[PDB]
């Protein structure tokens, strides 16, 4: 199933090299994972902790930090930046 990232999210995804306007959820999660990893936003010691308070990701998610363990929260934050395609 396809999703359409809203503009700030799409800009983030494009900043890692993605070129599409329409993605599967798995693609969105893949590119967002690469973004977090390459910008080194994760905690060195507990690498499920992500710090986004001085990053585009923080504006997008509306939080200063989160843990990868917070699955529902991550999806909630993602889905606010996407439209599901009919």
């Amino acid at each position: 199933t396809l999703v359409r990232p809203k503009p700030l999210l799409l800009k983030l995804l494009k900043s890692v090299g993605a070129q599409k306007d329409t993605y599967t959820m798995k693609e969105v999660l893949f590119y967002l994972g690469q973004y977090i990893m390459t910008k080194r936003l994760y905690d060195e010691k507990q690498q499920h902790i992500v710090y986004c308070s001085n990053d585009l990701l923080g504006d997008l998610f509306g939080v200063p930090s989160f843990s990868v363990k917070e699955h529902r929260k991550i999806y909630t934050m993602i889905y606010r930046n996407l439209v599901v395609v009919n």
Partner: peptide, 14 residues
């Protein structure tokens, strides 16, 4: 686990 391994866990369940 590294961040990419945590990432990969989440992604795989999508």
């Amino acid at each position: 686990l590294t961040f990419x391994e945590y990432x990969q866990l989440x992604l795989s369940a999508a």
